[PDB]
Amino acid sequence: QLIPPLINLLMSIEPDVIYAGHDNDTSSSLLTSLNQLGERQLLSVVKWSKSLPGFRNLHIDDQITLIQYSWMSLMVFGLGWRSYKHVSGQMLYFAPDLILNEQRKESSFYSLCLTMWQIPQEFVKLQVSQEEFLCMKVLLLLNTIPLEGLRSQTQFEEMRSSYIRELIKAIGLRKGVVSSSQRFYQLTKLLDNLHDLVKQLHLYCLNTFIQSRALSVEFPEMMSEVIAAQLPKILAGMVKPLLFHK
Amino acid sequence: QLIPPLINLLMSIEPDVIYAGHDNTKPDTSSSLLTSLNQLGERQLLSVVKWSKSLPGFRNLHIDDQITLIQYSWMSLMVFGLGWRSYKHVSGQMLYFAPDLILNEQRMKESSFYSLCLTMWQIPQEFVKLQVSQEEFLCMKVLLLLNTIPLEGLRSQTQFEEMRSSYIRELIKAIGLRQKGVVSSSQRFYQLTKLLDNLHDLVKQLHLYCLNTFIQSRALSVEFPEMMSEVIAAQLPKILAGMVKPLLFHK
Ligand SMILES: CN1CC[C@H](N(Cc2ccccc2C(F)(F)F)c2ccc(C#N)c(Cl)c2)C1
Numbered sequence A: 001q002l003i004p005p006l007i008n009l010l011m012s013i014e015p016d017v018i019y020a021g022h023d024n025d026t027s028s029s030l031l032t033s034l035n036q037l038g039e040r041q042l043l044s045v046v047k048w049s050k051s052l053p054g055f056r057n058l059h060i061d062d063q064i065t066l067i068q069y070s071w072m073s074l075m076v077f078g079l080g081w082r083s084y085k086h087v088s089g090q091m092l093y094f095a096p097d098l099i100l101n102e103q104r105k106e107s108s109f110y111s112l113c114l115t116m117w118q119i120p121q122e123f124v125k126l127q128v129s130q131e132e133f134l135c136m137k138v139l140l141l142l143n144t145i146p147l148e149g150l151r152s153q154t155q156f157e158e159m160r161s162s163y164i165r166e167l168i169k170a171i172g173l174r175k176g177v178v179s180s181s182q183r184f185y186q187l188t189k190l191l192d193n194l195h196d197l198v199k200q201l202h203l204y205c206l207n208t209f210i211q212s213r214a215l216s217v218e219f220p221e222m223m224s225e226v227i228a229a230q231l232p233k234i235l236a237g238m239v240k241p242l243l244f245h246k
Numbered sequence B: 001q002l003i004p005p006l007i008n009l010l011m012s013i014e015p016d017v018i019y020a021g022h023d024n025t026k027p028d029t030s031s032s033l034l035t036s037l038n039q040l041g042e043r044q045l046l047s048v049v050k051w052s053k054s055l056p057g058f059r060n061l062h063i064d065d066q067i068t069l070i071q072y073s074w075m076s077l078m079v080f081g082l083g084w085r086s087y088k089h090v091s092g093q094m095l096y097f098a099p100d101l102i103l104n105e106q107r108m109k110e111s112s113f114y115s116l117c118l119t120m121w122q123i124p125q126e127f128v129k130l131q132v133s134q135e136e137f138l139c140m141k142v143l144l145l146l147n148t149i150p151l152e153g154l155r156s157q158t159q160f161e162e163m164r165s166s167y168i169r170e171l172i173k174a175i176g177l178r179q180k181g182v183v184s185s186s187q188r189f190y191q192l193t194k195l196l197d198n199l200h201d202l203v204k205q206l207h208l209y210c211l212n213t214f215i216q217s218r219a220l221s222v223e224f225p226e227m228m229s230e231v232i233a234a235q236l237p238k239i240l241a242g243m244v245k246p247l248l249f250h251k
């Protein structure tokens, strides 16, 4: 085998296809369908984390916290991948039954789609491999901690270092001390920049949630709890984002 | 007499007494306390709208700017006013929310939000310490209304800038009424404008609690009245996310 066993393991634990449940055209039905997709994505991330090496060994509260912190980040990062893989970055591939092209219009909603659109464009530009993406995804899950830190801070630190090492192996699959180091800068800078992007997504999400009755948008129960319980404190800056570059 | 005209005007358009409509004859619960506070908050908001219509300069900003400045400043103005009534009526040593909702420290302790009461209680203790005059308070309260703008600015940005600058000059005059000499009066300016800068930090804690309470309103049996609900829904997450521009007097 020439692909490292951890990257191989990560490949094997990747989620199956997730459908939004959409009727194959208003922003209420769209948001409702995006919310259903959100619920299914959250369930998928939680199940995925049960098989992710190192993660089940963290304190249970740390696990829950890290999944809640990174819910939106992992969704948008997965959106970037699918859009890149299936439509060359030129549509937003939320799910096989929810693909948004030459916009499906004019509002705040479609402005946030253009912000989300930056990530697929960046995957196309950088030509991210699946091996790189899988290691970057675990680092995204581990990319923010509480201000007081985690209960299992030592285990968390070791797990982060292991996957940073695995991203470097991932980068090594394709040559040269200066080019592989430049590419590490570029890939870890993309992760840094996601904090600023995801902040815009969290804000719109929480606003939309608190006026959901007025907008006629149904918010499923599991994702409502992450939104209700975490997004206010996150938006307020009551968490510590982790950066690779000062 | 000695009092400048605009300060006399500010005193004249100050609100009437406002009651929370709280039933003090039965024991505090967290839902009855927060529900009475929301009822008080609604009534204060209405009075801030009425007061703003009489505030020289304010009516001549774009209707959007006026709404936005009220929606940005409502919590700041409430706790500033709470601090002033507490200072004036009970020597700063109880929280005087309204004539029918007064919390001494034991009643604060027995509430579910003791830490938040102690955060609010800091303001009156500062008023006591500095011996803040009514003339300074009245100018400082207008500066709070005008103390955060959108990141992209206001529609009437020039007229806002000019309105704010006039009340800063008026605060400088209110200071001169008592503080004589360049040394004392400019230090006093530093102290009072530093107090207003610090409120940005204090209010950030109140906003987070307020927004959490709002989201959890049904589970907590805490009713949020109409106008208070729209100001929270309109701006509070944006404000908390730092997607507005707080104005500072000091770097
Ligand atoms: C209200 N929210 C909650 C979740 C849902 N959204 C987020 C979203 C979508 C479009 C535009 C704007 C946003 C914003 F709220 F985040 F800003 C969502 C759902 C599923 C996926 C996937 N896969 C993604 Cl990448 C997003 C809408």
Ligand SMILES: CN1CC[C@H](N(Cc2ccccc2C(F)(F)F)c2ccc(C#N)c(Cl)c2)C1
Pocket (backbone or CB within 6 Å): B034, B037, B038, B040, B041, B044, B078, B079, B082, B097, B098, B113, B116, B117, B205, B206, B207, B209, B210, B213, B214
């Ligand atoms: C949920 N909020 C919204 C409005 C009301 N609050 C704020 C409050 C009260 C107690 C403890 C904590 C807070 C906090 F939300 F700010 F934190 C309120 C209402 C009326 C007055 C007056 N006068 C005041 Cl000073 C506060 C309760």
